[PDB]
């Protein structure tokens, strides 16, 4: 919904050819990872050796094109963003400037564009590799033991429901973190811009206490954030452990009872 | 069927008594009586509600006991595979022990609220019973047994020692609370409830278990569905939040000054123990998790021609503890980051209150960057001390990985490890290169910030004098310099990303070609596990660079002229 | 702005950080009595289960130590006749403690220790049985089943009686069973302040009911009206219409205490009225009529009232204007 | 200088030479009820043991008089089947009186005297069982488990209320279970003297609580403050600050009496305050706050007070200076 | 939680003065058991308009 649209405009800032190159790169990359090692499974029971090596080479070159595409699209998006925003902003009439407070409209160049242009590619590649290795290994453990899918289906539902639960918690949380973080910068701007007056009134201890309170507030908000994040972390981890156990048990039972090239068993369990 | 240790007349002449305690069946059964006793004496007085010194030691004992009882259940179910009557005396006692330990846990938790420790000494007599029975089993297990399962011997003595240490914990809590017949309870001054006073949000009142698994945080989130959270609907501080932290930082800076009579030295001297604690968590964790591939090899080769089941569920338990320890490692460090953030904001603000105006009027510092440092420097140091423990953690991990390769299937000619061995120079080089670029990137960012700030301050002047094309393209030049520097930065980070993800396939190729079943794929599994930390190290080194430069700017600011 | 007591007697106040712990081993009985039926049931059932299983393990262990499960040689006589499985010892424990004792499995003189176990299990069985039965009794003699039938109109009205402006409310008893020494304690509560300045959040003033004797006992057979005459000593003597509203700090706690007829024990019902529920200027319509050779309490339209105007000022200003009109 | 009643309700007075003896055979039940649990347990257990052993000796003696232990000739049938040892007769007595009756050892028509013994043991068993069960009941329905939760601050404060100098103290109930007809009897005790001269060591004057009605009942849900207004009729009307101290013969006995909600029985808590514990010139800080949709009784800082000055003279000299300032 | 409890006119709308089937069950609504009760008094006492 909203995430789809926001990410779509983000990538829209990039050329459609970047979408093609990125997607093909990720997919072919990790599908070749799966290919080469699941086909090493066929190696544990030379010709296969040499083509194994050429599969390795394909993997490495495809990783390189992948990462290069990642960095280049991040940079192109950032460039289009900063230029277009700066243009549209300076071109706004005086009604906006006199109506809107400067700190807000300023922060989007100050910290928001900073966030974008030097943290988006990191997070995007983290998410991309994570989710693609994930879905790939899911499909593969399903394949090596076709029994596993029946166990997989309810687990995915549990994941979906509890993660939507955590997200409906974390949205309110992160909003609270934002609104508890703003008065820090506000009081700092006040402190510096009216520093002479404060020294004159000799009330320094008062604003010191006020800032102590503000900082304590931000800290408690962040601790809320962390507690929530770690709770979801724990729950999802235990889901993953259950997954591992199911796969291992199913594979062992099937293989030693109904032989299936136990190399495949090791493969699924890893 | 379902006989205790029952088989045909050959073993129906086993329950005979040629010496009562000489019958293994008999001591095996006697070792159930205590667990029965507790499990049935405590349930009612637990369902009444359901329907403290020496916390840490007691719980370490209890969880070690948990692990070894799981091991004993495994051993029992395994050793029952040779008979054909399913004599269940091998494991049934260990299952009752599992349940009884769990009940002891939950019971003492629900008694720790209102401890009537004369009601708690039921545990005293109980652990005495269990200890006695297990000592009897061990003693009579010296002789009268083939001891062909030496693991049986070790686990038996092990449980004996654990029950003994538990008893010692019990006499500790007794003495401290001398109540039983003594007059002095040395009763209490619990800050957990008292010092909290009713407004708090943290772990201390929660048990070590939740302190690892966030059950209280589960409750906290529970309301966030039924009702939108609010700032009044928020817990308060711990009594040691950001004031005792600031005092400790001042005192540690005083100690470091007496030593002197950069700021990293003072920070470390003030702070390093909690960091090395989080690290120790990370090390124990990833070292345990490092016994993952061993389970894989065992799986495959045990299948080659049933102990693979228990071995796999052993890996299951291993990963359970593994990630519940990763959580401890991570949370300690994020908590560290919060404390340092508060303390540094305090200290910076004090410097502000002592800032000389002329310093702001004439030269180096402008309000913009003075607030931008606390806005961004602090976030970056926070993130640096998120990635803090991983740094000291990985080398210990990589060394154990190499040693294992030398002792595992790649025993010799595993040469592919030399690839990652040579990788660390590539990492440090990309590091110093990103560092060379980062200063220019940061100075250009600051220039552009000064640009836009100054611009939109008197934006009406610009709208009036028609100088906005002029100033806008002037800023565009700065943004172009920043774009170029960030472009080099992006090239370098992409180089790091590719090298990161590229060296594992290099390693697997080189190893598997080095030869010219389980071995190859088990090593490949270890290689997955070993490339896991590198993917994060990619950003670890970036955050390292940025934190270095950021603290440089910090010390730059702290050394300013002060009104006095 | 919470209600002190709910319109159904719930004391809507949490304790939040009692200092000390509970009762050493007596709180068990009290906390046991007042408690949801299925939970208490389950507790007793599971007590019987654990008592049976514990001695079951005991008897089984004794038979096994006597070397009585293996041999069946015919010569050696058991501690207890004819037990061969833990199931047997469990059946035996049930037979013993429930005092059934079929006879197929029976204690023998061959084990005096077994005789000790028998004595122990019988004593424990009698003790636990008496405890369970005393608890079941004092639970089945429970009160507050009647305290729900003691009804109170959702509204209270004020009107003029004897030329005086008195706060009223109708009381209701639905059971034909009679309450003894039914006593009323109307009690107004607010955050009030002494002249010296101290304020207490839930201050409590026992506002006296107007009784011809002056006491607080009533005789409730037909649901009647309780009322207070607002005198210069009553705190409500500064009350005015339109001062009452759901955002006016004000509440009058109504307490009904008497003895149940069948069970000599005492029960208490509570109801409360904050400012808005106190309807100004009405009268409860008489719900009683002389039936055919009977008194017909039309329990329908129970709290239905009728509006009547009144001097819309404080009883203070009432006496002010009244003195001005009488000394004229 | 002892405390009349301990700060926890202990009546710290010994009797020392009651003239007469106790109750002939009824004091057994009363002295049995209120008594430490293990002692009562042991008494009942040992009653069952002696009842079993006595009839065990009886049955054994009967079998032996019937000439039933020696012969085993097969012809003569026993008084009771298959008993050969005193252990047998003891098992039989347990089976009979506990109503188990396995059957391997069974009464026979061959001895009518044995039938008499059976009847006797059954009657005695039922009588003793009912006695034990009535005692266990009235013990498990015991009070004063609640009377420990009824808490009282370690200090009492005086202050000015309504321009008057009134002695106060906060009361506390920790259980959500409610007390019915909670009644207060503050009672000052000292060694006072009539004008004619007679002095009595522990003289007792019921000092009345200030209640809007005048009665002594309260409605304790949130732990509130009990207070006495010191009038020229109150004995404390000659009290002054700095007259109070732990060596000043003075003490005010506080009595709380009401009905337990679950058990219709009545309990009483006692607390006392001698001169020093009566803090002069303070006010108990309000431990209640309007919680989020609730009333928050902060039970922490329960008896924590706050110091406030005051005219440091007797309520006598208070009215003296007040009359001098009002008639001016 | 929601009982959707009631608004029974059978008793409420009747208000205490009524003579008909609705409160009676379908069975009596076919067999006049309530009418049996109504006639029951007509023996012991002469009926009246009140
Ligand atoms: N919050 C509380 N909850 C329950 N009982 C309490 C509480 N505070 C005190 N008490 C009990 O009341 C009795 C007298 O109270 P006291 O006024 O001495 O409290 P205190 O010792 O001063 O503690 P605090 O300073 O918290 O009030 C003590 O025996 C104590 O057990
Ligand atoms: N010391 C005592 N302890 C208990 N009861 C007593 C005591 N003294 C008298 N009584 C009882 O009080 C009742 C009336 O008391 P009374 O004043 O007659 O005592 P008394 O016979 O004069 O003995 P004394 O001269 O010791 O007081 C008598 O029935 C007696 O049983």
Residue numbers in the entry:
A (entry chain E): 994 to 1038, 1061 to 1285
B (entry chain E): 2 to 52, 68 to 277, 286 to 329, 353 to 563, 573 to 620
C (entry chain A), D (entry chain D): 32 to 359
E (entry chain F): 199 to 248
Task: Cite, word for word, the article reporting this structure.
A broad and rich body of literature based on decades of study describes the biochemical and functional properties of KATP channels (Aguilar-Bryan and Bryan, 1999; Aguilar-Bryan et al., 1998; Ashcroft et al., 2017; Ashcroft and Ashcroft, 1992; Hibino et al., 2010; Nichols, 2016; 2006). These channels were found to be large oligomeric complexes composed of four sulphonylurea receptor (SUR) subunits, which belong to the ABCC family of ABC transporters, and four Kir6 subunits, which are members of the inward rectifier potassium channel family. The focus of this study is the human KATP channel composed of SUR1 and Kir6.2, which are found in pancreatic beta cells where they play a major role in regulating insulin secretion. By virtue of their sensitivity to both ATP and ADP, these channels are thought to couple cellular metabolism to membrane excitability. Three naturally occurring ligands control the activity of KATP channels: PIP2 is required for activity, ATP inhibits activity, and ADP potentiates activity.
Cryo-EM reconstructions revealed two major conformations. One is similar to the published structure (‘propeller’ form) with the exception that the NBDs are closed in our structure. Upon further classification and refinement, the propeller form was determined to 5.6 Å resolution and the quatrefoil form was determined to 3.9 Å resolution. Although the final propeller form EM map is of lower resolution than that of the quatrefoil form, secondary structural elements are well defined. In addition, the L0-loop is clearly visible in the propeller form albeit at lower resolution. In the propeller form the ATP-binding site on Kir6.2 is buttressed by the lasso extension, which attaches SUR1 to the CTD. In the propeller form, in which the lasso extension/Kir6 interface is intact, the SUR1 transporter modules are held with an offset with respect to the hydrophobic membrane plane, as defined by the position of the Kir6.2 channel and TMD0 domains. The consequence of holding the transport modules at a shifted position with respect to the pore in the propeller form should be strain exerted on the lasso extension/Kir6 interface in the propeller form. When we compare the NBD-dimerized propeller form in this study with the published NBD-open propeller form, we observe that dimerization causes a slight tilting of NBD1 away from the center of the complex. Thus, dimerization appears to exert force on the lasso extension away from the channel.
